[PDB]
Amino acid sequence: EDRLKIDVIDWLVFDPAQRAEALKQGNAIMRKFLASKKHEAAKEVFVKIPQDSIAEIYLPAEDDNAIREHLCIRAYLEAHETFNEWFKHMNSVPQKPALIPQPTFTEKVAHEHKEKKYEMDFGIWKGHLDALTADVKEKMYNVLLFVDGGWMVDVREDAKEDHERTHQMVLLRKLCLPMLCFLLHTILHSTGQYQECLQLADMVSSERHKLYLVFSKEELRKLLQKLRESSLMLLDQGLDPLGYEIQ
């Protein structure tokens, strides 16, 4: 039935006079797929939506929200497109030169070089990494700290009742905000940014976002056993739990 739904979109996109209904329905369809984490499904739909839809449509409470929801959804997708690239890279680290104990004088020199070339690649694989870390992070904070009212949260409050959508928007927050936090923690930990890891407890507990309400009690503790792990590595470095110099 996947196709039935992703195909009803091209029918609504065809007629430009129904772009407001095409987007709204595109949202709904992408709300079902997100709850299943079908990101190639959600995105295959996301491209069918002409890149210039938003511009033309220009506002009923149903169109202000659907424009916001669409960008929220793009902010979410882009937060998985850049992580899978980053993650793919983290798993392609240059491998150490192989050792040939009891080497011939030939094998000694081939190895002096293979050992010197590797000490060039590992520097760039931290180079490319840093730039894929700086980018995946930004996206994770665009979703977690979504501007003007939080992620998947309507700004317009005068639409007509849509319990399906509304409760779909509360759910999407409870499936994906705990899951984006845990990823960002995994990104920060993987790159050794431990001080910042611990600063996820400010972001989450914050009264500005009230992200902690989107967490189950279990997920919290789990995030608290994740932070205590970053803390350790900060002690091993000689700093206090939170990364500040011990005077």
Binding site: F83, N91, S92, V93
Partner: protein
């Protein structure tokens, strides 16, 4: 079964004719093989084949083109004689059943001489004397009646005897007739032929004795327009009257081409089928050498399809049927670069129609008829018989019966097509090819495996396994039903030393090992399952192997990379369980290895997997 009693009997006869050619034996007489069934039906059909045999029993030039034999004046002349000999003998049987009530009744008393029969035939059909007869009588009958019906029965000798007893009355007709009986091809010399024709035309154009009129222009082949309707009232009497009047190379003359065309063009089926008697028209076309017309015509009668197809086959196995080159033409047509007086039969279409009826539930019999198309191809080059077997297998789905079932023990019990050609590698791929194009992989594998095409068998077997690698193998599941066939293909491929290219082959045996890895993992045999994954050297367990294992993943079949997620988790969960039961350092070290590998590998669900892997390693410490 879709075959009626008559059709079935013909099928068996065509199986024999095929069994003979398939084993190289003598080419038996097809016409005889078909008349063998005709006698099981009413004589309406028997008398047809009698005509078919006698019309095709002409001295031919073996290994000569069909169009050439049928255009040659040599052959065209013998057709007329074979027909006249049929119309004469056929009429002779009518004269017997007219005098005696049954052919058997005539035989027991003995067939009388054609003279005494004819005399005993005149008694009935003219009891009282007609006042317009001439030249007196002979032993109680008009001399001209005896001469006509004797010639009609085909016994010229019996007719000449009548002439010898009326020498004084008949005048100069004796020396003329005695020449006709002597000269071959039922023709007189131009000089004498001129003498009699002018005499008849002089003052006998309208004589009160119709029998006299008939004989004269049967001997002189004159007055072609006058159908002598006084004596030739039946249709066969007309055909016979005219075939004794046709000529070969300008006035008062008729040729076979004109006559054959004149008959069906001006007086088509409509004229000869008003009495709702179909064979009457068929005999008109067949006894005039228009075999294609008669075949198509008779092929449309839904009750006589069987008979018309076979009379086509006979004409086809005798190089007498004129096939239509193009397969896009109608059933009956005249080629543009041929004379208008001949027609052509789209033989390919003819059989294709007949077959569709009983091809669905009677495949064996269908093949016997498809064989006659072995000598023809299509626009794309395929062999028509081979293509017909492909289409018949795609539709009927009768693989074991027609293609030969390849059991799971390594045997190949031959199929019905094996009889006709020993090169069965292409069609098995053709049938396997489409079923592959229709997502029927489990079948395409069995079919490709039937032709020992391991390149395709293992390819498809890779696709059917990868989805089911991590699944739970349960009784009658789709895993068991696929794993058990894959293993039955692994043994038969090792015992027979068969293998595809190493890429396809390596992946195939690799999946089989993984399927064993999860079957042991889902059973709780942790120790045993850990040992298997270690052999495969697919997931690194010591930090030193990470570099090489990571490079290998890049060129491993995507059917493997797909299942990498479930492999890492099972392997981790394996170490995970063994931890709760120095060794602790060793598991801890291996735990780390899996993570770094997964970290450097971009793969399916790397997000959820890499996270779970790290959590399970933390609980260990």
């Amino acid at each position: 079964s879709s075959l009626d009693n008559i059709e079935m009997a013909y099928a068996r006869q065509i199986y024999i004719y095929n069994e003979k050619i398939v084993n190289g034996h003598l080419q038996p007489n097809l016409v005889d093989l078909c008349a063998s069934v005709a006698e099981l039906d009413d004589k309406s059909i028997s008398d047809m084949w009698t005509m078919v045999k006698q019309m095709t029993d002409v001295l031919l030039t073996p290994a000569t083109d069909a169009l050439k034999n049928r255009s040659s004046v040599e052959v065209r002349m013998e057709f007329v004689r074979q027909a006249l000999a049929y119309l004469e003998q056929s009429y002779k049987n009518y004269t017997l059943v007219t005098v005696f009530g049954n052919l058997h009744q005539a035989q027991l008393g003995g067939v009388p001489g054609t003279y005494q029969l004819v005399r005993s035939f005149l008694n009935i059909k003219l009891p009282a004397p007609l006042p317009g007869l001439q030249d007196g009588e002979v032993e109680g009958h008009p001399v001209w009646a005896l001469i006509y019906y004797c010639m009609r029965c085909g016994d010229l000798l019996a007719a000449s005897q009548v002439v010898n007893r009326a020498q004084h009355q008949l005048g100069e007709f004796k020396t003329w007739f005695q020449e006709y009986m002597n000269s071959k091809d039922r023709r007189l010399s131009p000089a004498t032929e001129n003498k009699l024709r002018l005499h008849y035309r002089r003052a006998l154009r309208n004589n009160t004795d119709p029998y006299k009129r008939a004989v004269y222009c049967i001997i002189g082949r004159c007055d072609v327009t006058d159908n002598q309707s006084e004596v030739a009232d039946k249709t066969e009497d007309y055909l016979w009257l005219k075939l004794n009047q046709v000529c070969f190379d300008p006035q008062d003359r008729l040729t076979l081409s004109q006559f054959q065309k004149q008959l069906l063009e001006d007086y088509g089926e409509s004229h000869f089928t008003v009495n709702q008697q179909p064979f009457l028209y068929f005999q008109v076309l067949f006894l005039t050498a228009q075999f294609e017309a008669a075949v198509a015509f008779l092929f449309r009668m839904e009750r006589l399809r069987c008979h018309a197809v076979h009379v086509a086959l006979v004409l086809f196995e005798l190089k007498l049927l004129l096939k239509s080159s193009g397969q896009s033409a109608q059933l009956l047509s005249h080629e543009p670069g041929d004379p208008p007086c001949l027609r052509r039969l789209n033989f390919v279409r003819l059989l294709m129609l007949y077959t569709r009826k009983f091809e669905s539930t009677d495949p064996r019999e269908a093949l016997q008829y498809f064989y006659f198309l072995r000598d023809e191809k299509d626009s794309q080059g395929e062999n028509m018989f081979l293509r017909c077997v492909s289409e018949l297998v795609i539709e009927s789905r009768e693989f074991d019966m027609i293609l030969g079932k390849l059991e799971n023990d390594g045997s190949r019990k031959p199929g019905v097509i094996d009889k006709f050609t020993s090169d069965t590698k292409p069609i098995i791929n053709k049938v396997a090819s489409v079923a592959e194009n229709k997502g029927l992989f489990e079948e395409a594998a069995k079919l490709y495996d039937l032709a020992k095409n391991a390149d395709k068998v293992l390819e498809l077997m890779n696709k059917l396994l990868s989805p089911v690698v991590p699944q739970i193998s349960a009784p009658q599941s789709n895993k068991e039903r696929l794993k058990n066939m894959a293993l039955s293909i692994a043994e038969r491929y090792r015992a027979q030393g068969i293998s595809a290219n190493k890429f396809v082959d390596s992946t195939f045996y690799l999946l089989l090992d993984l399927i064993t890895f999860f079957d042991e993992y889902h059973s709780g045999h942790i120790d045993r399952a850990f040992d298997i994954i270690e052999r495969l050297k697919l997931v690194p367990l010591n930090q030193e192997s990470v570099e090489e294992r990571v490079a290998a993943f890049r060129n491993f079949s995507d059917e493997i990379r797909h299942n990498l997620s479930e492999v890492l988790l099972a392997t981790m969960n394996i170490l995970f369980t063994q931890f709760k039961r120095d060794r602790d350092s060793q598991l801890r070290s291996q735990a780390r290895t899996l993570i770094t590998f997964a970290g450097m590998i971009p793969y399916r669900t790397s997000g959820d997997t890499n996270a779970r892997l790290v959590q399970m390693e933390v609980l260990m410490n």
